[PDB]
Amino acid sequence: VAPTHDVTTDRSQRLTLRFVPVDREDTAYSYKVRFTLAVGDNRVLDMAS
Amino acid sequence: PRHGSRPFMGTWNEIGTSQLNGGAFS
């Protein structure tokens, strides 16, 4: 049997979050994009995702 | 090439009931 109320959450979390680029500078031989990663609160993001 | 890596005092799947992946059941 699975484990219950203690590993999951009924509050509306998200699974896939877009992070539209904050700032996009540039050059010829290069590319700069600076997002502002927001890990919400009580969430735990693993970088591999 | 090096691995180490942690998390190994065993595992839980505690009892009073048993393990995960199902054994047999789509």
Partner: protein
């Protein structure tokens, strides 16, 4: 023969409402943590316990008894069990379903006689001997009455050596064993060759000698005097038994120090 039925079936309620309620000692925080499926499949048990059907169990508490005393052989408790169940599954009723209960809670308790059966061998040792002593001649042999002391040493031997000391009646002649191994089978209707020397001061076939050597340890100042032969021999057999103990410890010592060797200058 019951807990072997308990420990062959029936995987309590106090132990269940002692854990859900969290009244245990070691790990009170045990039932709380389970998935909320189990905690709702063990609370509706110690809130409205579910009945049971005990027949099988105590019926299996009777088979495990028969096959341990000796009726229904070990390999037949699959026909006996079905037959008993079906009989008790026909005529069942508070009649039988109780008459069992008594049988199962008495057969495991009325086992003291069985224990006695193997603690004074009052199954084939004294009942047989106290039968054979009633087949002996009258208890007034001509020569002497050292007879009775010997015949009592026999009973003491049979009563104080539970090992097996069975007394068969292998047809007309009752024969004394010294052990289930039986490598000292002496014929006890063939010491009507001691109703000869019961009182005197090479006519003993070793069979008689075997009986003498078998009981001697249990004779002290009983068979007594210089009542011939029967007297001494018993004393000489006891002396030889003591010397045999001495030589036994000696030989173990001399073979632990280190081939015939010791066997020569011991025997």
């Amino acid at each position: 023969p019951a807990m072997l039925a308990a420990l062959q079936s029936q995987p309590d309620w106090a132990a269940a409402m002692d854990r859900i309620l969290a009244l245990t000692t070691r790990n009170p925080e045990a039932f709380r943590q389970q998935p909320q499926a189990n905690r709702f499949s063990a609370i509706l048990e110690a809130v409205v316990p579910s009945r049971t059907n005990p027949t099988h169990e105590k019926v299996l508490a009777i088979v495990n008894a028969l096959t341990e005393s000796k009726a229904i052989r070990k390999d037949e408790a699959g026909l006996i069990y079905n037959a008993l169940l079906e009989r008790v599954a026909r005529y069942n009723s508070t009649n039988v379903q109780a008459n069992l209960d008594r049988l199962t809670t008495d057969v495991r308790e009325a086992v003291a006689q069985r224990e006695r059966f193997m603690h004074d061998t009052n199954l084939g040792s004294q009942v047989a001997l106290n039968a054979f002593l009633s087949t002996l001649p009258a208890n007034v042999p001509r020569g002497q009455e050292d007879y009775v002391s010997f015949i009592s040493a026999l009973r003491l031997l049979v009563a104080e050596v539970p090992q097996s000391e069975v007394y068969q009646s292998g047809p007309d002649y009752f024969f004394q064993t010294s052990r289930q191994g039986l490598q000292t089978v002496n014929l006890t209707q063939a010491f009507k060759n001691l109703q000869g020397m019961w009182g005197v001061r090479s006519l003993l076939t070793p069979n008689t000698r075997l009986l003498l050597l078998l009981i001697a340890p249990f004779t002290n100042s009983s068979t007594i005097s210089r009542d011939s032969y029967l007297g001494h021999l018993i004393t000489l057999y006891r002396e030889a038994i003591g010397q045999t103990q001495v030589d036994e410890q000696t030989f173990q010592e001399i073979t632990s120090v280190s081939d015939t060797g010791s066997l020569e200058a011991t025997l």
